[PDB]
Symmetry: C2
Subunit: 298 residues, 2 copies
């Protein structure tokens, strides 16, 4: 009644792992499908597409470790718990608590980075993989130039040593989260989002500890995550799992390169398509996004 329930019919679950609890909304029946959000959002970003997927799947809509209502494991000097390798291990443990050792996976933004790292580390856990509006972390850094440095400035700003980004973000947190939501949409304002969802994102961003977690995520993104990707690309390791890459016609991924061509170097069985949308596919273009996921996973 403070924050709205945007998943009518879904249960709420607190799933224990050795690193802390994962919060998730659970609905539907059939094969299991895990959906992962990214920055600066929570699990509620899937509220327009999850009911359509729940017609054929058991849908598990989870807050990433340290995000939303999931617990925040204590970080260290190498940002270990917020590396995508560690987040993937934690979510594998969460799914085992529900009896799911082989599942389908779709991720957006940071959640898509957890997802492809999971596929490289533990491919036997996945039946099929979908990533929304990303290229691998290694590719963003290797294509770093003037134009991309300006477009994804937050990759270098949020990775500065603590407490610099934390202190600046505290300067106007409501403004910052709303500016990020609006600036990455095709419309350029907040009119694509459900106002009740925006309230979820604004409340999460209001907590200083939650903002610190997000900075640790981006710190890992500039250091350990990049090194982990570098090992795979220099060894020629590919994702063996069937994979779908979706991206926004005016999103982030298409600024760096031709997404489907990039992912071919990283995966052996990948298909893709553009969606008429900005970065936030499931909220800007929910019907097209759900159609493409339904067809791919079934």
């Amino acid at each position: 009644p403070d924050l709205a329930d945007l998943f009518p019919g879904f249960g709420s679950e607190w799933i224990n792992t050795s690193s802390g609890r994962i919060f998730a909304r659970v609905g539907g029946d059939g094969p299991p499908l895990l959906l992962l959000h990214g920055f600066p959002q929570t699990h509620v970003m899937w509220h327009r597409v999850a009911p359509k997927l729940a017609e054929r799947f058991k849908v598990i809509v989870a807050d990433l470790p340290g995000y939303g209502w999931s617990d925040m494991p204590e970080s260290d000097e190498q940002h270990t718990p917020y590396t995508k390798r560690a987040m993937a291990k934690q979510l594998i443990e969460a799914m085992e608590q529900l009896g799911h050792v082989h599942f389908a996976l779709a991720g957006h933004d940071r959640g898509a980075r957890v997802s492809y790292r999971l596929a490289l580390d533990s491919p036997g856990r996945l039946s099929k993989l979908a990533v929304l509006d990303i290229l691998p972390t290694y590719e963003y850094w290797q294509r770093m130039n003037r134009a991309y440095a300006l477009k994804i400035y937050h990759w270098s700003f949020l990775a500065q040593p603590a407490p610099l980004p934390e202190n600046l973000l505290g300067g106007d947190p409501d403004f910052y989260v709303k500016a990020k939501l609006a600036s990455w949409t095709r419309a350029g304002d907040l009119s694509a989002f459900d106002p009740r969802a925006v309230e979820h994102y604004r409340i999460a961003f209001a907590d200083p500890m939650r903002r610190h977690v997000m900075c640790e995520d981006y710190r890992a993104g500039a250091y350990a995550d990049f090194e982990h990707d570098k090992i795979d690309v220099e060894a020629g390791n590919k994702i063996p799992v069937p994979m779908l890459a979706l991206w926004g016609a005016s999103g982030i991924a298409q600024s760096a390169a031709t997404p489907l061509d990039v992912w071919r170097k990283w995966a052996s069985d990948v298909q893709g398509a553009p969606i008429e949308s900005g970065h936030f596919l499931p909220e800007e273009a929910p019907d097209q996004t759900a159609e493409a996921l339904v067809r791919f996973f079934s």
Copy 2:
């Protein structure tokens, strides 16, 4: 605020784009000194007295900085492009009767300086630049490692009001964080506390902070375009030039400075100095001696 230039006069120079504030001392050939970010003219307070023994020293606040007036900006950040700043400083010097002068700049002021030399070389007898490479070269070498080192080049260039709103929460923190982080020691020990107060009070004005972002916005767009035309056309600076850099400073993170400046200038000398970014305050005696020797 303390007077850190005993014996220097104070001048308010009129130009078409607003007044320039400057301290003036000494006697001899004219020498203009320009500061950068996030500082004011007082950064020269340890070096200008040595220079004043031999030169007519003019220590100016950049357009929009310190006590100089703030021309209103536009959608292309025109008044805070280095081309425009150079033109405004040429007019200021003409008001004093100086149509041919020597010039030394640090940080943003060094970028005004080398742009002045490319646009209007006949105005300069000699030029010195401290701890910079040309703006084009910073952007051309912007890889992962450098993007993390000079993140503020992309953060402060974001569209208004995003940097301004974040800086407004705790301005004192950000200005001191930047002063500390670019010194060799990593703290504020190298600065005179009275000079830090000057920089802190300037940064506390929201209009002054907006100007600094407009300067960085020009640095990401029009300044880069202007440099790109010159380098792709093979236009080199013909003025005799000195490039000084800190061994722990910013310029040497991207590349070997002297090799880069030889691409941009036909008569360049260069020397490292054991210092962070803030040469005139971290290494005053070495900096002053290098300048006196070059300009004489």
